[PDB]
Symmetry: C4
Amino acid sequence: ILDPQGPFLQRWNKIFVLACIIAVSLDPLFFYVPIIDDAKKCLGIDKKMEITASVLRSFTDVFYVLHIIFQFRTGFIAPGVLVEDKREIAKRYLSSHFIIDILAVLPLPQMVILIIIPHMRGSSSLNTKNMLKFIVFFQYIPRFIRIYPLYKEVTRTTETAWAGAAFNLFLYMLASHVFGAFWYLFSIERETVCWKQACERNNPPCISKLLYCDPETAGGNAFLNESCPIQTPNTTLFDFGIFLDALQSGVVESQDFPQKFFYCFWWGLQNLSSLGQNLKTSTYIWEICFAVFISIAGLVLFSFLIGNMQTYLQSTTTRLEEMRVKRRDAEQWMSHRLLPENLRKRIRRYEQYKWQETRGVDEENLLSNLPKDLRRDIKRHLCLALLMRVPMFEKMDEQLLDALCDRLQPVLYTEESYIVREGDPVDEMLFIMRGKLLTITTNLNSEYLGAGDFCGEELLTWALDPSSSNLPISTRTVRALMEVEAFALKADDLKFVASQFR
Amino acid sequence: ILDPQGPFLQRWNKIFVLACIIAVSLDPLFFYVPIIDDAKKCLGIDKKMEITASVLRSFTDVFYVLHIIFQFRTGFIAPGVLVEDKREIAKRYLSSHFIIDILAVLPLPQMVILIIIPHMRGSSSLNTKNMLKFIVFFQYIPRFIRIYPLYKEVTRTTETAWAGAAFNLFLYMLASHVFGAFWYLFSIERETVCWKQACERNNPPCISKLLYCDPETAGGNAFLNESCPIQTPNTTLFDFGIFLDALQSGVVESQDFPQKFFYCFWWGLQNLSSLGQNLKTSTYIWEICFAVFISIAGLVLFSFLIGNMQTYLQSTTTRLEEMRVKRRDAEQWMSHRLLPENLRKRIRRYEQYKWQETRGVDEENLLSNLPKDLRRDIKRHLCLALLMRVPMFEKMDEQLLDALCDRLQPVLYTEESYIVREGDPVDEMLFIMRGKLLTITTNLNSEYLGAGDFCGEELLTWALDPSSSNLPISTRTVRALMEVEAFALKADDLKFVASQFR
Amino acid sequence: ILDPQGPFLQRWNKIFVLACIIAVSLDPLFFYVPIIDDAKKCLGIDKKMEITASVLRSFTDVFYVLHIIFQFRTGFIAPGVLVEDKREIAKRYLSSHFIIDILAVLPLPQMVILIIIPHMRGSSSLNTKNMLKFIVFFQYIPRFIRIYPLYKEVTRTTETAWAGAAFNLFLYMLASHVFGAFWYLFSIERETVCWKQACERNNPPCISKLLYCDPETAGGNAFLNESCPIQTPNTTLFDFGIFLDALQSGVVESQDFPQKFFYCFWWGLQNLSSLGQNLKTSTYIWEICFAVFISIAGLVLFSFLIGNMQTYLQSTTTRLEEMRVKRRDAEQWMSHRLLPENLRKRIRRYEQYKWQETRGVDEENLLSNLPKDLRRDIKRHLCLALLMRVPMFEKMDEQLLDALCDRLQPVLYTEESYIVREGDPVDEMLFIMRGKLLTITTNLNSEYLGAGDFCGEELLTWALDPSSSNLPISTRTVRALMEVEAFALKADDLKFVASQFR
Amino acid sequence: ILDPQGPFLQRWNKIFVLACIIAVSLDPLFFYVPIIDDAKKCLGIDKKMEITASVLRSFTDVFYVLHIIFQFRTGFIAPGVLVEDKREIAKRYLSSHFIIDILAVLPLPQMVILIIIPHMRGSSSLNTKNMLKFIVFFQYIPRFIRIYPLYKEVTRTTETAWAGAAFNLFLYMLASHVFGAFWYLFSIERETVCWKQACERNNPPCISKLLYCDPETAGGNAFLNESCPIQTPNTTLFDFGIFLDALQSGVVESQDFPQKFFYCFWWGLQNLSSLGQNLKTSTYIWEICFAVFISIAGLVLFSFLIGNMQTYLQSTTTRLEEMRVKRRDAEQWMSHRLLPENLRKRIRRYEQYKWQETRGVDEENLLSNLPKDLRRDIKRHLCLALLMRVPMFEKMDEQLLDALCDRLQPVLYTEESYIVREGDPVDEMLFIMRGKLLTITTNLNSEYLGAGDFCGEELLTWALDPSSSNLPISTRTVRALMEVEAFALKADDLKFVASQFR
Ligand SMILES: [Ca+2]
Ligand SMILES: [Ca+2]
Ligand SMILES: [Ca+2]
């Protein structure tokens, strides 16, 4: 007995939503089963298409009875503890989704082909076209409201930035295949409607068996190329409208399936992405309603694609938008304050240096939203080896240096940048990660601070004497020579660490 | 007497904005009233369309006199207290919107059909085409500036994420119906302009009654199929341009309304979504201006749809965008700090565990924006039963435990995660909701903490002694074995609760 | 002498950017000047179009010499104080934009028509077509880089939410007019290229004067309808491609300008919004390059519209998006915490009540970003009359009640909502704006609090005694009966006001 | 030896990604090499196109062997210090990208033209068409997975707001050129497939050499214009479908390259931006698959453009959106509080004055994110000369005035705005930058404060006496006469500066 967030179901019920897109990608294959033999002017059956659609539907419908038996041993919880007991798992399923799952999985086209049509009354070709049209209609509803609750089951738990656009592009291909096989079947039905109407006014006499094919009967009603003209059209006799391209190309006579599939799929793709622009309909109402439905469905898909894409694109540009709004803010604040050009280009230098190092990421906000031992292991990797180069800090344990790694903040310094000047109070104690720093004094000798060296060691002796609250006056003037990365130790954060050291 | 936010008006004035879209969805039905009988070459009247458009307009125009009487008893307020007094409710309405509401509701097409046209001078068919063209023009303006203030009344108070797109898709259908009935009427007028011009140069002699279709008169000017060719076109004689499809399909002769409606609605839908691409106009100026107007209106609608959709789409992805930006921020911060792979995959584990639990929701910010008794009832449901398993906390009342439920913060812990180690100061007191926790000590024996158990009970005895400010040293090392949900009690938040307990 | 933010220039240099769109909306009118007389097979001049384009260009080019003299008395500032002195205003202008402003304003088409063409060598009709084609080419560059710095002058200072879309829709109309008059002129040039090439192989003898119209000559080369077929096309002789529609419609022969303008503007609008779909080009390279340029320009113009529209749409939905995200955050936090349905629907009631009152606006953040005297005048309008109903607060001056109006915070309460219960400590002092409140006590009698009444008067006597820090215990249980708006006075904010009262 | 962020590589490996777009913009030039001579009905070779494509490919393939030798001396780092040592630089490159970089740079079309085809068996024209079709196929894969890691190398480091749209517009031009040369080559192959099939059923007898075009042999199979009709098409014999336009225009026979390039590039641009709308395919499967691929690629390309443009557009409106939301928040907060019109238009005046000065930029947040010496140099430019007009502040050094420039905050005041009134406590000390201020007193005389003057000098003597904590009472009422910019000095920030002055 399992629960819906258990690892077996949560990896197996993603294959079920996949096999329900495979299932609706094979239901229009039964529309390619009726055929027209244009020599004898008869409606026929593509027998090998009839087998191909029946076993492709079966092999995806013995994959959803496996969903039915995996909902008899699923997990209800409450109105914190799951229910592992049957006869209430198998009573809410039988009150919520069991019949829709069993009306969607019944082999209704495969059983009407094997059982019902060879024992029906009339022509086998007309019965096959009429049963497979309506059974695929009447099973079209539970095969789509079985995917509504199974998607509500996975909105309570794939995703990438582009997955909404890739599923959108697949929805073009599925709808183009559905609309084109509908167009195939409606083209065959409009030609047989022409044949029936021409036979009910039989100036030339018509025999009604011979509209339906039968290999025992050779030859059919030969006058039907006059009353139902296709290769040269006469819309006074019959306007075929948007179905004339299917009857002129001979796709309704071919028994070659990739020939038949690709011509009709491309009709669906051409007219969905055109929003029905080039559909020259006749005055027939249901042909117009088909073209209206193609126009609306393509109108709804294209707008989704443009959106699913501008979403992919904008997902990938936030920190970069946020930098552009800050660079344009550093502009027109300078030239509203009328800053001199030596001040403005130092501002542009720091904001570009902060951008190429951090990329908009606030490191302290990123680390504070981590757990206290994971944040400790990061800051002991970054900051602890820098603190071991101060000749006093080895005297502390792994309880006070862990207070110091917690209080080290990363700072950035461009070139020409002054860290401190002689005479200023010392706020920080730096621990240099990168860059070279020239320090001078007039009290002369010029020292150099590289990676691993530390500035501000006047401040430790101030924040150890248990002393004045005014900061010690800098005896050195420290200036950066290259881009400097460092870790800053503030005065009061060092003053806290002084109280736990005696 | 009512006020505009009162419950009667605020549910009844949403039916008024609905009946004003039904009203503009039936005004182009009067354009389907003129008819052409192509045998006799006469302009006629569809009499049953003339009744259908008159009673569909009446039954939506006795639904807006109900708006007029519901503005005589509405509520003015001031330049906090509403005005319930008449003769100033019925004086600002008569200075703001009363005449536009009464110019929009006058039964001008129904009264010109029943009264004015049977007592006019000329032909009844030409008068019906000319009056219904211009009255639907001249009443088109107050039937659209009556929806401008009624929409300003409901911008001061439906909405869903997709309602802007569903109203956009309905605006296609309304504009396609308007543009297609305009195209129907302009096609009839271009054929009668051809008939008038052919009769003013009568090489073959023409009688001007017979352009207008009387059932007493049989037969008309038979030479008009020569001078106004339609079924085979000659643009030297007359170029019908974009109206030739209406005259060749026979939609201007049919009295079958769903035949006539669907052919013309589809023309409007095909050419709006094409932005007027396939309109092969003639050199006639107002035909070009009609095609320019179709092109602009379809540009405007399409751009709105694409926007209304991307809004729906983005309305559904904010917290999920915010997770992807944080994930792209965690990457390239790791590999800029060059973190080891044991540290990086622990970061990715916590940020994915925090995502699948919280989905970006900050619980403390969500609870703090709630009222103080509603926030109290939530935290007494979540946290109070967990506090009753500490063997001291039953000694408090429902005034001090309510201070403790207010200070419990939810924390998350992945697997392998250390809560505390032996030797560290104890900051928190946990109250485990989920997961198993192995605690050890070397002072050996290994205990286990499950759901309902609590960690950090060294800290209560510290924050009861009225003691040192340094936290007690942990005697245990607690480590998570599975994903742990818990509630954390900080040291100073427990130190507050100690002062109200004696 | 003026400065660029002075009120004269800043209202007058918005008419200058308007007259520079009027100027480029009249430059293609010189392309409608050449004409073809198809009877005599001659290229001619539309003389009244030649006057109309010359005075429409003049009346917008004596509107930009006014820009030249308003840049001789403009204001330079520095590399805070403007420069009001000439000879340096009129030396940077002569080094930055003076020649581009004078190359754009020279009456080069009007002066080649009046002076240069009547004193040139060759045919007056071919010289008019060739000069007006190239002078409008060679003055097309400075009439567009004169709008680049003048737009940089107004990005340093109209805007609405829809102005980017309305300017976008105007950019369709301007580009359609430019592209269609280009198509008009290129159609005339392709027919004369046919006439010249047919005359250089004169199996039928051709006289080269007679391709150019001269009203003295009557009759021209009559064989040119054979070698340059238009009304029935033969692409073996000459393929006119995308220019055949202009030569067949007779728009290149008409001297009726609104006939000629609207047919060519509609060609530009039809093919820009089609992105060049229906352009059936010939194999001519520059015809293809024209069609490639129409395709790219429409591709760029459409993408901007879709963006400009969705900016309009999203601008108007920020707080409403922010409410929908908060509503989707309240859901799945409830049903992740598994809250009972009495708790969940109270949460949905408060968040919908807060939405319909505030519409996402934080009032305290809105008021704090206002100046201190403007924020004082608002809070003395809202809160001071409510404070005058407490019978102690009239004893204070307009220095201490102004401290109380500064500390009053707006609160909201739904129905059934408990303000305080008997036994709870009293945190707030309410001042009711709206709604009715039933207060009870068991110490029984039930009082009622309406608009103007105040709750929490136990707390003033606590925060006047100079007393315990624990809050006074509520003797009443106050519960809301309707939606309550009130102003809350916190305990410590009342404790501050107590120190300035003795 | 260099590293990937070193200045030589980081400027030279942007030319490498440029020469890899030039490289894929010249691979379809080999598809323009086969030619059809329609008189003799033979497939031939364009010899000068064969040289032009070979030297344009060579001159961009001796530009990527320079990338191969610049990856033998690049910089590995670790699993902070780079590796400058060979034999491990040249062992990971030989395990990651060396063979894909050498399979992409091999001169396979140039060497099959010069070496392999003159020593092959069969016809030289059929071998040239078949080798150049498949070698450009088989080298198409490593010439595109060589740009995947080189782009991953520059996502770890151009950009502008419009660069994603300009690269998108270039991706139209590259794909249109690729698709149109594919269409050129597939048009030639469909005509030769027609010639082969007509020769395998030789009612009229066909000689198979003469399908391949040798200058020694004059004349070919002349019956092929009957069985493969092009100029008048017969789809019963052969349906050329979407390739008929190439065979009818004679672009497959022309040896004029800009004629041939522009006709085929425009076919690609017309059908990509149409998403394959106007492609009238035949029933041939791979022609349909080509048209399906054009439809999908244009569907993806267009959606990206619309997104890349709306990103540009929105990049430019983030602060201006933020002002419009704040303006829509100020409205309906006023008229929910029912503020009087003298209060509302003062609110609209300040929020518009703050907008035209600051443009949404928070100056204190902008300055605080700058380094402490750069922020000091800005505030000494803005604020120090204003502080030197107070007659006491020259007595301080450059250590205490630097504390005062750090604490000066910019304030804005509209006209009619009261700074302080007589009787109010003085919170601020202003330092006027702009505007005139009328100050009065009743203790009368009216003074004036201009730029450089300072208000609030009652407060310095309060915050120097080492005194009461209550602020001094204003003896003046100061009111603005024009828009005032000033710097504010708060009372406690002046009280800090008092402690360091004795
Ligand atoms: Ca289109
Ligand atoms: Ca089209
Ligand atoms: Ca489109």
